[PDB]
Each structure stands twice: as C-alpha cells, then as structure tokens.
Design a protein around this ligand. Sequence first.
Ligand SMILES: NC(=O)c1ccc[n+]([C@@H]2O[C@H](COP(=O)([O-])OP(=O)(O)OC[C@H]3O[C@@H](n4cnc5c(N)ncnc54)[C@H](O)[C@@H]3O)[C@@H](O)[C@H]2O)c1
Ligand SMILES: NC(=O)c1ccc[n+]([C@@H]2O[C@H](COP(=O)([O-])OP(=O)(O)OC[C@H]3O[C@@H](n4cnc5c(N)ncnc54)[C@H](O)[C@@H]3O)[C@@H](O)[C@H]2O)c1
Ligand SMILES: NC(=O)c1ccc[n+]([C@@H]2O[C@H](COP(=O)([O-])OP(=O)(O)OC[C@H]3O[C@@H](n4cnc5c(N)ncnc54)[C@H](O)[C@@H]3O)[C@@H](O)[C@H]2O)c1
Ligand SMILES: NC(=O)c1ccc[n+]([C@@H]2O[C@H](COP(=O)([O-])OP(=O)(O)OC[C@H]3O[C@@H](n4cnc5c(N)ncnc54)[C@H](O)[C@@H]3O)[C@@H](O)[C@H]2O)c1
Lengths: 254, 254, 254, 254
Amino acid sequence: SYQSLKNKVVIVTGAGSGIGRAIAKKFALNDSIVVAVELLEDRLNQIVQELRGMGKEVLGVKADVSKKKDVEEFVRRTFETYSRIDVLCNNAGIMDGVTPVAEVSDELWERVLAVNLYSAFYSSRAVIPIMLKQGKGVIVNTASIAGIRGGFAGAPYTVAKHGLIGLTRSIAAHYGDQGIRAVAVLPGTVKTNIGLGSSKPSELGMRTLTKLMSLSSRLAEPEDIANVIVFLASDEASFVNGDAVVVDGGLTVL
Amino acid sequence: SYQSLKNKVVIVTGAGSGIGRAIAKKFALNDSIVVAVELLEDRLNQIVQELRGMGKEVLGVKADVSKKKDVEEFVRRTFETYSRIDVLCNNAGIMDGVTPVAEVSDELWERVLAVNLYSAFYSSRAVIPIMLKQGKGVIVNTASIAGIRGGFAGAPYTVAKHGLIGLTRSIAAHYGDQGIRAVAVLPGTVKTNIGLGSSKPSELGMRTLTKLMSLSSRLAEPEDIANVIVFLASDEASFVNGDAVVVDGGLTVL
Amino acid sequence: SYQSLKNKVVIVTGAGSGIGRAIAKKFALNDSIVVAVELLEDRLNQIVQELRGMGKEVLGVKADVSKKKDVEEFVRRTFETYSRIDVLCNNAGIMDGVTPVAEVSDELWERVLAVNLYSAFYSSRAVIPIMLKQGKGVIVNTASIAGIRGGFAGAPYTVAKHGLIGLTRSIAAHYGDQGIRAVAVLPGTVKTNIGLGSSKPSELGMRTLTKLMSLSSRLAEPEDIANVIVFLASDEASFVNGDAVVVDGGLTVL
Amino acid sequence: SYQSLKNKVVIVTGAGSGIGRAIAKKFALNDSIVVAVELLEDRLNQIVQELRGMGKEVLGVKADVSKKKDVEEFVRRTFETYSRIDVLCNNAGIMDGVTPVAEVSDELWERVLAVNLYSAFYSSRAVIPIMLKQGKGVIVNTASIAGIRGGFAGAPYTVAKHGLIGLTRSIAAHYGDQGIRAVAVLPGTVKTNIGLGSSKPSELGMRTLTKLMSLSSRLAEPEDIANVIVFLASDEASFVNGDAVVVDGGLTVL
Ligand SMILES: NC(=O)c1ccc[n+]([C@@H]2O[C@H](COP(=O)([O-])OP(=O)(O)OC[C@H]3O[C@@H](n4cnc5c(N)ncnc54)[C@H](O)[C@@H]3O)[C@@H](O)[C@H]2O)c1
Ligand SMILES: NC(=O)c1ccc[n+]([C@@H]2O[C@H](COP(=O)([O-])OP(=O)(O)OC[C@H]3O[C@@H](n4cnc5c(N)ncnc54)[C@H](O)[C@@H]3O)[C@@H](O)[C@H]2O)c1
Ligand SMILES: NC(=O)c1ccc[n+]([C@@H]2O[C@H](COP(=O)([O-])OP(=O)(O)OC[C@H]3O[C@@H](n4cnc5c(N)ncnc54)[C@H](O)[C@@H]3O)[C@@H](O)[C@H]2O)c1
Ligand SMILES: NC(=O)c1ccc[n+]([C@@H]2O[C@H](COP(=O)([O-])OP(=O)(O)OC[C@H]3O[C@@H](n4cnc5c(N)ncnc54)[C@H](O)[C@@H]3O)[C@@H](O)[C@H]2O)c1
C-alpha cells in the first residue's frame, strides 16, 4: 500500500460504478477516508456498504455534480466532517451518443459540458482554498483519449474532455508552487456502464468510432485505471504535476 | 494572392480589431467576399469602410457571437445574400483577467466560455450543413497557445481554448471525408486590443504569466496571424485538416 | 506567387522525385533560385531539365546527403554561386522496410538515421552561420507523422523522424531571435517513389501499418505537401517557428 | 511495495549514480533481482555492495552501453544467470554542454547519440525476443523534457531524447499486443551528477536554458523519478503502454 494515503480524506465522484467504484475501493484498500459522491441512490448505498465491509471510514453523499449547489455542499460537508480535503477525484462523466457537431442539440451540448467539465470546475474552485490552507492537495481528473484526439466520441464529449485537460493544466500551472498538484488520467476503452450515452448513437459519429475500434481488441478493467489514479494521488508521484497520463494500452500511440 | 479564394464567401468574427481586422483585409485583398461580424458598432463601420475603400464586397453584421440567435441569424443572412458559405473564421474572443480557478466567478466562467467556445460551436453547427451541401468548406478557429499550455491566461480562457482545439479536431474527424476542413491557429503574443481582459488582473495569475513572458521575444503583428489563417483557408492547404498550427515565433518550443 | 520568394536561393534535397521534385518546381514557379540536390544522376538531370524548360534559374548538385563532406559541398557551391542561402529544405529521405526493433540490423539502423536525420544536422550546421550573417534564413524539414506516432513505419524511420522534429525544435529555440526559422512538415501518405524501403517488408511491421492505413483513404499528391513547404518558407509565415505542421488530410486527428 | 515485482529480474543501466542508483535501490527494496549496469567501476562496486548489504540479490556488470558488444553481453549474462529478463530500464545518459547546432562537433554529436539513444536500441533489440518468449516484459526509458521541447539542452541531447521517445512509441506500437510494454519517463531538473555536460557550457545555449530554469525553483530528488519508474514497471501499470510520462513538477505545463 501507499503509506502516504493512510487517513487522507479523498472525495471520489461517480463512485457507484465503473472506474469511480474501483477508485473508491482502491483508496479504501490504502486506508484513506473516502467520501463517495454518486448521483444514484442504490449505487451509492452499495459502494458505501462495501467500504464499510472493508472496515474503512466512508461517507456517502448523493449529489449531481453538474449542480454547483450540490458540489459546494459536499465539499462543505467533507470539511465539516473531517476538517481537511487531501485528494479530489473528478471522475463522474457521461457519454454523448457519439454525436457530431451538426447533430448536437443545445440540450446535449449543455448537459455533457455540465457533467463532464463544469462539475470539475465547481469542485476545484471549492476545494482549492482548503488545499492551499493545508499547503498540500491533489486533484485527479478522469479525462479520456477523446481529450487529445477527435474521433473517439461525439463533439460535446470531445470538447468537454479537451477542456478538462485544460482545467488540469491551468490548476497545475497556477497553484503548483503552493502545494497543489493537478493531473489528468486519459483512459482508452474500459469495461464500465457508461456505454455511448444512447441506444442509437449517431450513424456518422459511429462510422468514425467503429474504424478506430479496428485498431485493438484490448479492453481494460476499471481497476487498471483506478490503479494509476491512486498512485498519482500518493506522495510517490510528488513530482507529477500537470501531466495528462494516457492509460489506453497503447491505442493512441499507434 | 490565392486564386482559389477569389469570390469565395468568408465569414470573419471579431472583424473590428486586431487579428480579425487583419483577416478581413487580407481576404478582401484576395478578392473574397467578406462578411464582417463584430460586436462594437464603430469598429464594425471602420472595417466595412476600409474594405469598401479598396473597392471590395463586404457585408457588415453587428452581432454578439456568444448569443446563438445572433449567430444563427448572420449565418442565414450570409447564405441568403450570397448563396454560399465557403470559409468560417471563428476569431472573436476576449481575455479573462488571467483569473486562476479559485478566483473565477460564475459570471466570468460563463462569459469567457460563451464568447471563446460556444460561439464557435453555434457557428459551426449552423454552417456545416451548408458546407456539406456544397461538398466543400473550411472552418478556421483562432485558438491560442493557452489551448495547449496552462500558464498563458486564466482558467476560463485556458479551458475555452483547449475546448476550441477539441471542437476543431472533432469536426475534422467527422466531416473530413465530406469535404470539410477544420483547422486551428494558435497565436502566442500579438499586438492587438485584447490586453489582459481586466484593468485589475489576478495577482496570482499575473505572477504565472510574467514567468512565461521571460521566454518571449518579438510581438507578432495581427497580419502575421492573418497570413496563416488565409493560407489555411485556400486550396493550397487542401491537405491540412485537424491540425493546431502554432504561430508564436517559437515561444512554446523553448 | 509569394513576392518574398522571388530570387531567394533555395536548396532542395531529394529534388529528383516525389515531394522534392514538387518542391523544386513550386519554388521555381515563384521565381526562386533553386539548387536541386539529388543522389541519382538521371533523376538530377531530369529535374534540372524540367526547371530549365520552365525558363527558371537552377543549379544541380549530385550528392549523398548522408555524407557530411557531400553536404558541405552543396552548401559551399551554393554560397559560391549565389552568395547567399535563404532557404534550406531538408527533404531527402528513405523508408525502412517497416522493420520493428528486434528485426533491425546495425546497417539498417545507421543508414536510415544517416539519411533521414544526420543529413539535416549536417546541412543545418553548415548553413546556420551563413544565415546568421544574413540576419535571416529558413530551414524546412520534411518529417512524417511517424515523427509523432509509433505505428506508421519501422523503428529506424520512426526514431529518425522523431529526432528530426527535435532538431527542428532545437534550432528554432536557439536561433529564433537571430532571424532563423526552423519548421517541420509532417506528411501522412503520399504517392511517390519512396515505397516501403524493402521488397520484403516486415510481416509484423506491416500488420500494424496496414491497420492504420485502413483508417482513411484520402492520399495526398506531392504538390499538396510542396504547397505547405513553400508557404512556410515565405515571409507570410514569419511567425511560424519550431512548429511541426501536419499535412495528412486528418489521418492523425482521428 | 508492489507484489508483482518480487523476484522479477530488472536490468538498470547507469546504476552507479543519481536516478539510476535510486532506481536500483527502489527495485531492490521491492525484492526484485537487480542487474546493475554501470560504466565506472568504483560507482558500480558501491551500489552493488549497498544492495548486497540490504540482503538483496544483485549482479554488477561494468559496461559501456554505447557499445553493442557490451550490451549484448550483459543481456546474455542476465539470461544465463537468472533465466529471465522482466524489466529493462534504459537510464544511463550524459549531457551535451547545452551546445546549439552550429557549435556541435562531430565527436559531441556522435557520443551523445550513441550513449543516449543507440544504447536503448541495442538493449531493446536484445531483450525483446526474450520477453516475447516469456509473453511479458516491460522497457522503461529515461528520457527528458528535452524530448518534447527544444530549449532544455543542446542539439545532441534534444535530438537523442526526441529519438528515444520515438523508440519507445515504436516498441509499444509493434509489440504491445504481444505482452510487452514500453514507456518513457521525462524528468525536468534533478540534482544528480549529470550536470550540464561541461564546466563551460555554450553561451548561446545557456541564454535559452537560463530563461527556462527561471520558471521554477522546485527540484525533484532522484527518488522522485525512481518512484514513477518502478510504478510503471509493476503490474499496477498494466494498461500504460507507449506514453511519455512527465515528472517535472509542472515545469513544462506552464
Ligand atoms: N469506460 C470508458 O470506456 C471510459 C474511457 C475514457 C474515459 N472514461 C471516463 O471515466 C469516468 C467514469 O467512467 P465510467 O466508465 O466508470 O462510467 P460509469 O457509467 O460506469 O460510472 C460513472 C458513475 O458516475 C455517476 N454519474 C453520472 N453522472 C453523474 C452526476 N451528474 N453526478 C454524480 N454522479 C454521476 C453514474 O451514476 C455512475 O455510477 C468519466 O469521466 C468517463 O468519461 C471512461
Ligand atoms: N492578441 C493576442 O495576444 C492573442 C494571442 C492568442 C490568441 N488570440 C485570439 O485572437 C482572437 C482575437 O484576438 P485579438 O487579439 O485580435 O483581440 P481584439 O480585442 O483586438 O479583437 C477582437 C475583436 O472581437 C470583438 N469581440 C469580442 N467579443 C465579441 C462578441 N461576443 N461578439 C462579437 N465580437 C466580439 C471585439 O469587439 C474586437 O473588435 C481571440 O480569439 C483571441 O483569444 C490573441
Ligand atoms: N511519400 C510518403 O508517403 C511520405 C510520407 C511522410 C513523409 N515523407 C518524407 O518525404 C521525403 C521525400 O519523400 P518522397 O516520398 O518524395 O520520396 P521519393 O523516394 O519519391 O523521393 C526522394 C528522393 O530523395 C533522393 N534520395 C534518397 N536518398 C538520398 C541521399 N542519401 N542523398 C540525396 N538524395 C537522396 C531519391 O533518389 C529520391 O529522388 C522523405 O523525407 C520522406 O521520409 C514521405
Ligand atoms: N539529472 C537531471 O536533471 C535529468 C533531467 C532529465 C533526464 N535525465 C536523464 O536521467 C538519466 C541519468 O541521469 P542522472 O541525472 O542520474 O545522471 P548521473 O550522471 O548522476 O548518473 C548517470 C550514470 O550513468 C553512468 N553512465 C554514463 N554513461 C554511461 C555509459 N556509456 N555506460 C554505462 N553507464 C554510463 C554514469 O557513470 C553515471 O553513474 C539520463 O538518461 C539523463 O539524460 C536527467
């Protein structure tokens, strides 16, 4: 285990499924105190009961990270309960139907940007003051290879993930000298419940995604991403700041 | 001049000053039909007058590119007036006071993202169908080196510019086989009226920017950026699609 | 044509075929003085005849760019003949059989590196002092998308093209404030005489390459690459320095 | 510690000092079997005796990694002695006096490329067949931020490191589906014995480096780099392949 993570207070969003669930369990396995933030009631109760079963300290919070009020509330609640916030994992996200620009409705554009990008801006803005007062904090953002390439998702998701990497670089640049580290992890194809965000994704968007899927038959498990996120949050990575770490098995290096 | 630009219809946003003004004049000198879009009336009239004084065809449109209705209206007006839209230069943009995440108000965040990013999504969504009909079209987005690095502006601007490069890659990927090219130009430091976006820029943000200017040398003239934009819009650049072309004199290569 | 290129002295290596031939012709059409550097006698005489048939000024020099003495020779003869060297296009290059690391012989490794990378180091080292004295000069290196990705060629070519971009960045960073610009152009797939570099290309290497080639079907013509190289050599690109401009129709943006 | 590294055979080049010594010790503490490769005998003896003292299994090999015969020999010796090679850390390297292109002598260019790049080619070529037979292997290359930017070192070093990243991507692309992972770690400024490669570095080269070194005062310790290298060599990083991980405290994100 990473000794530096023992008793550190870690907020994990989207904790009820896939990568988020794996992140929560991995941090718990390292004796961190986990604040599991999840939109869905039953999923939240399930991950909370699992961590309790592991004999770890866990606080469950039902919230919609696209809502500023919900975010500010769980940040306040975490601080009031534990008196510190050491790690923030902005992980919750949704897909966009692989919808290309001309096919994007105002509703889709706004919702994907809100859940995948605004959420991280709200949380980072709220937690940074607390981390600065501590003189130390780490923010890990779950981006995607869609944050560096153009055909792995629709326009809303691609734009939001590029923007999320931008937010990561911004935080690292401005606050790195004050004890804050911000890093982004870019998964490729992972077996989770996110899907494509639609039972009928754009035919045009799929024409591109399907071709890219011909490049590899490898599918990562949530744990493979969580392993990297937890490492980056530990003092073992004290000098990794601002990087966009790709965890795609080599897919984008071809 | 570029023969392939003669009589082509080009929309240029932020045409009343700096890079936009230079883009409009350059296309006009290449005998393109220019639709000059600008928020400020006096600036709009000035650029319109400059092009007409050269005997060139120009249509002035006073609009706020952060408003979807204004964008959809100038696209419809351009098509109704000239029956085609060959090039779209999403150039208008504003700075963000070099404001770091913790100091960003909801207002600033929304305003910078709307002007610097949403504007481009609105215009691209509206013009793409017309370009697909034509079987040809070029979208050139004026990004910034803040779209690939984290200390050249505040968080809102950095996030918006990263998102704009993402929008560019998305369009290039999905519509490249249908005759559309989308490219981004990333200027470094250019002599214009954009400034820092505030008379009282963030102290923390400025500390960061100042460190970066220690790497700077020459200041580009707006024409130096416009020259690249116009070239990319011509058939000479038929195989440049999706790239984020850096025009910073070498600042980011250090 | 670009007025700033009229009567400028331009050295073009690998001028006897494909992209190099197209580069020589394009500069000639812009009334530049072209020094055609080529390894093969017949090809050299062919491009020289073509330029003379166009009524343009050309100097032919047979040389093997992998030999430092030969490089010093064409640089010196150019200077003796025209008293200046304004543009150096390091374009000559060969493929590597798409040979993966484990299958690379010492001879193949050295040959590919010498022809595709060392050649550009030798020529740049020789022309820089001349250009600094002039107060102005431009070096354009023809790289490849294999210089930013790993499956587009064998190991020798990929390493050499990555090194070439590094050489480009180095020159741009160190001499940019003294009037020198160094840029790289990265083509994707172009129909020329380069082939695969072997009659029996690596089975393993080909499996990877073939999958990537399946992603898109738009193939650039040599003229499409020459068009960007000539523009970058002109004063229109005075603020483009150190960038690796991708000209692949969008292949690497997917 | 990482369970997956217990009893794994790890080759560490440049093990007698700085980052390499930290790498050797870190793997030893994970109970890996360490093959310490170092040029200088006294340094080699010091690290070998240090690990032996810790009660760990270590094999010292005095070798010059720029010599193919030396590399092929320590690879054969490792396999003959331990019957397997699980991890290869190509870490040895030297600086280049921050020498810019025009000032580079053939001796400097040749030596730096040989030690910083050819060495990794020789070792990778020799160990890949062994790893392929095992169905698993990891190669970690210690590059540098000079592998992605142009002003952090002289031309030889910058070109060599860019090429090393290319070698990394090539191996990852071609062998990633066969059980091999190849990754690069890019340190910024670390307090070791490498220095600037000269007590009288190039004046011109230094003009640029000095500006970059003015961006941050935070310097990583060798252990901070070793921590990331060891993590990437473990099964925890099973889905990290072909990436160039930056460990510079945020220097290049500005
Ligand atoms: N699975 C992949 O292939 C993949 C690849 C690259 C990046 N990612 C990124 O990984 C992150 C999570 O991915 P996942 O695959 O585990 O998905 P998932 O759907 O399995 O899990 C996401 C969890 O987030 C929760 N969630 C969604 N919207 C929320 C909101 N507004 N507020 C609070 N919780 C919300 C869900 O209810 C769900 O439990 C996202 O940022 C996603 O974009 C996934
Ligand atoms: N100048 C630089 O240093 C620099 C560096 C990198 C990128 N850029 C980018 O260049 C573009 C224009 O830059 P500039 O420096 O010429 O600025 P500028 O202020 O000189 O010109 C921008 C013009 O856009 C107009 N504008 C602003 N908001 C608008 C809105 N909502 N609707 C319509 N018009 C609007 C302004 O009124 C102005 O005339 C921006 O996207 C900017 O981010 C500039
Ligand atoms: N054609 C493509 O698909 C492609 C894609 C990306 C990059 N490139 C790059 O474009 C450049 C030239 O490519 P091309 O496709 O026109 O190839 P080509 O083979 O058609 O032309 C190259 C010319 O270089 C000459 N040449 C080869 N070795 C030489 C040496 N040692 N000294 C002097 N001249 C030499 C040849 O004789 C030939 O006339 C190379 O750097 C290549 O790597 C090509
Ligand atoms: N220290 C830094 O600031 C820094 C920053 C970025 C990258 N790096 C990279 O880290 C690696 C090692 O760096 P370091 O700072 O620990 O240097 P160091 O000088 O402290 O240690 C390097 C060790 O390599 C050995 N060595 C040199 N040439 C050799 C050869 N031909 N064969 C075998 N051994 C040889 C030396 O004798 C020395 O013990 C290099 O690849 C270097 O480029 C260092």
